[PDB]
Design a protein around this ligand. Sequence first.
Ligand SMILES: *[C@@H]1O[C@H](CO)[C@@H](O[C@@H]2O[C@H](CO)[C@@H](O)[C@H](O)[C@H]2NC(C)=O)[C@H](O)[C@H]1NC(C)=O
Ligand SMILES: *[C@@H]1O[C@H](CO)[C@@H](O)[C@H](O)[C@H]1NC(C)=O
Ligand SMILES: [Ca+2]
Ligand SMILES: [Ca+2]
Ligand SMILES: [Zn+2]
Length: 843
Amino acid sequence: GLPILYFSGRRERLLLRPEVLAEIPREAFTVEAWVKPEGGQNNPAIIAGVFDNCSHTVSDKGWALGIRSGKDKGKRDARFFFSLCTDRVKKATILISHSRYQPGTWTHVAATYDGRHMALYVDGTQVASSLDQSGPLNSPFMASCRSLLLGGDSSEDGHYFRGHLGTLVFWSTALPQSHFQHSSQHSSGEEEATDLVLTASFEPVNTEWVPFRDEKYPRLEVLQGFEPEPEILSPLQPPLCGQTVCDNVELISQYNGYWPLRGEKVIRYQVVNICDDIVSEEQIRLQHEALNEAFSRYNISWQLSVHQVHNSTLRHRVVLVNCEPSKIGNDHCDPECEHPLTGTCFDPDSPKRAYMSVKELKEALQLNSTHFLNIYFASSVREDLAGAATWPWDKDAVTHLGGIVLSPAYYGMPGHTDTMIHQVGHVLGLYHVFKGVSERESCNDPCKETVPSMETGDLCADTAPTPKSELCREPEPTTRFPGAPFTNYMSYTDDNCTDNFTPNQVARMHCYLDLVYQQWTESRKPTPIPIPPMVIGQTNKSLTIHWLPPISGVVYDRASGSLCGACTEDGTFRQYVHTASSRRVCDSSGYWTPEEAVGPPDVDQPCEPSLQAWSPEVHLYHMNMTVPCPTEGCSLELLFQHPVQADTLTLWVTSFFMESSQVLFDTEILLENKESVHLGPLDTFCDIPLTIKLHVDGKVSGVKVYTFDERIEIDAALLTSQPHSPLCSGCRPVRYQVLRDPPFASGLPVVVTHSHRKFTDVEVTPGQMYQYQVLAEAGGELGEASPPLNHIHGAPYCGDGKVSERLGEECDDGDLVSGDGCSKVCELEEGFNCVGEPSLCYM
Ligand SMILES: *[C@@H]1O[C@H](CO)[C@@H](O[C@@H]2O[C@H](CO)[C@@H](O)[C@H](O)[C@H]2NC(C)=O)[C@H](O)[C@H]1NC(C)=O
Ligand SMILES: *[C@@H]1O[C@H](CO)[C@@H](O)[C@H](O)[C@H]1NC(C)=O
Ligand SMILES: [Ca+2]
Ligand SMILES: [Ca+2]
Ligand SMILES: [Zn+2]
């Protein structure tokens, strides 16, 4: 086990005992540490640093390694930093990393300084270097006035570090860059024995370290067994204009190319019958036939399920889309509520009112939205607003609040069956063909579709850019629009000529059916592995192939009604907020309601004002009455459905205005059948999710965030349970099956039952071609095969430590992790200059 020092920001500052170390390096040094930071640390947080001891005033002299945030930004863009200030140069010189740190990821942060060349490395890649400082750090005469601290700063401001510190190593000379990539391989070399000044152990803390100024000892943790190696493949983050992993160019291309990834899917959709004991049976039958005819050519058929609601109470009320009962009486003209019945019982607070909102109908019905696509019938006042649909990337895609709302008069009637097809396409992740030219904000909008592209507009190349036009002809020049797709189902053109979905849109329809709506289909086969396996290691006798998990992300045998969907491969249990509340006046307008802090995060642009996050202060129609937070502070009580021994808690605070560090005045973790534990004020960044490791002796069932800030916005919150939580005890992990171009021994696929997604093959002969395919089988129902990895044994490949101009590689850093100087496609990034066969990128 590796001892670890967790600093919680709760007054834990260590100091080096004088007896342990004879003298701190003065001329040259090399400080390296495995630091696992957590979201929302102090602005100039220090993980370690040598500071003046004799001087009692502010002591920026010496050096400090940690995390710093840009002054011009302050609230966001926090990057690893290393600030050194010798007695010669008046101003401290700060090396700042190139990327904002990743909380929860073990990062090997190192920094060397020998004479003048001071360099800062992250995970072995030199992310900064400078020569501003020169000469020895300080005169030896006052060398006794320099002392080393961990997770703190000498100043009284208390620059506390929040996160884990695994190991700390201190040399007296700047080690070569190649050491850091091979820090675990340079195991106490004989030649550098005299240079190894310090090697912190941390198992006994009292033996080597003493708390600074009565502050408590930082918590001591021990790793039970060897931890999994750091992930070698970076996640497929969505593009700038995308919103999901199915908007990525690589996965989209794989779905367009590999036709098994567009197989026969049979969706299930539910229809809430609306007819006197409005929507008759003929409407349902005709609409179902039209839907099947318009969607079966794309290997998507639909099964009809009609849910008859014999509640006359809901039968009589007019259901209005987006017209909440509380909107009436706001001194403004609301287009959604210009109904005769909204201005015989028009009182919103009456149990027998004749008008209702579709949200209320959804909440009252609470239909099974986990296995069905529910269709609702709300009569919208607007004649042009036929209906609405829920995005896959919205928090309510599969919950009872999701589905399609369609006007009864436009459902199943001849000449109007294509509106439901449009809305269903909206459900399955399809934007409007006029996205980027009609639905564009400004001329600088990246999503603007000037040329057929997979990253702008509706994220489809086949769909040419066209303005929103009702004519079934190429629009007039407003930029020209040749070959406008007025025949596409996702255009505002009438039924008579919108007929087809382009292959790109069909690939999208299938990608989002596998990703989010897997449960809707009747297939028990787990979703398909999105990207083909890639080779991460090769020898003269063995080949190692790594593969991503199923696109849906479910790594367990998904049984209907079970919790296996949210269980990680090691038994962890991740769950978002299930309920919310606020002791401030619960605004009835429906905006910034506690339900906005429920489910997965929704804020598209973090750290800017948004309508998808809870917020106390924001009142639209009361400008003079700027209600401030009470003395007790505005509170948000997020309740999680299932109590579990919490491992971690994450708050998505995506906005705030108070420049003080006390935006979160307190964070009271609520246990079950026990008292609540207060965690005191915590710092947070608007762009990063604040993270807290829960050291609590009980089952956490909620969190009560107290805030003195009026404009703070909590977009969502997540609770991660202890590994091997019981909630997933009955769940069965998903195994994997691998097939090769030649049949394996006996010809059967190899069964990889592990959870780190790696397979080693020893039956490979040099010079032969092999085709690797992977299935994530579960429960005996074998899934779909992955796209084929074609590799000739011995051939060069990315992430093999050898640059090859033959294959177009530039920086083959030896790993498939992007951002570490070179991309996973073995391509030089901006500002990086990777040199040497084991490429060592640098700014
Ligand atoms: C729809 O699914 C069918 C399978 O039922 C796919 O069919 C194959 O099509 C490819 C070309 O795309 C051919 O090379 C194969 O020989 C076909 N096989 C069979 C069994 O038909 C079809 O490609 C899919 N198309 C879409 C748009 O989803
Ligand atoms: C959704 O329908 C399936 C199919 O029978 C059922 O097993 C499941 O329990 C339903 N959802 C809920 C939340 O009950
Ligand atoms: Ca939200
Ligand atoms: Ca290579
Ligand atoms: Zn639309």
